[PDB]
Design a protein around this ligand. Structure first.
Ligand SMILES: [Ca+2]
Length: 177
């Protein structure tokens, strides 16, 4: 006894799909004929791409597997006219948010310039994406080495730089001189 007849489906199944009847019986959260399209439940973000059910693949710089944490890495620029973005450069990675709310200069590429305090709280604060509460940043820690002097300490609303004697903190260029 022999037969060339296919004792099963005809189409092709991938992605946890059962190949029966004529169409693929898709894995949970998969759609399409061969079930190769995953359900982008909460919507893709940052121009990503759906790879699994609700698993969108996220481009760069979003923490949390649902990329709604749009923290891109960028150089924090400290002084901008049409002339320079700072003038001595710096691989200070922080968020634009940080650089705008606190320090109030610019950040990113190519040179994204912003006012200081954006939200009506206090420049040294960022509205918690959880509570909504304006929280002070350890600007010292949150804007890597922005203070060029001796010590850098933090109060809410502003950081405190400790300068050697004779020196004088200049918050225009966070410089003790
Ligand atoms: Ca602070």
């Amino acid at each position: 006894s022999a037969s060339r007849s296919i004792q099963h489906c005809n189409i092709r199944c991938m992605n946890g799909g059962s190949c029966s009847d004529d169409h693929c019986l898709c894995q949970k959260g998969y759609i399409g004929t061969h079930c190769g399209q995953p359900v982008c439940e909460s919507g893709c973000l940052n121009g990503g791409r759906c790879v699994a059910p609700n698993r969108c693949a996220c481009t760069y710089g979003f923490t949390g597997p649902q990329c709604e944490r749009d923290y891109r890495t960028g150089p924090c620029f400290t002084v901008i006219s049409n002339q320079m973005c700072q003038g001595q450069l710096s691989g200070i990675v922080s968020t634009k948010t940080l650089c705008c709310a606190t320090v109030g200069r610019a950040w990113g590429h190519p040179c994204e310039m912003c006012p200081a305090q954006p939200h009506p709280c206090r420049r040294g604060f960022i509205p918690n994406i959880r509570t909504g509460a304006c929280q002070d940043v350890d600007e010292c820690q949150a804007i890597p080495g922005l203070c060029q002097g001796g010590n850098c300490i933090n109060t809410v609303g502003s950081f405190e730089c400790k300068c050697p004697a004779g020196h004088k903190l200049n918050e225009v260029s966070q410089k003790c001189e």
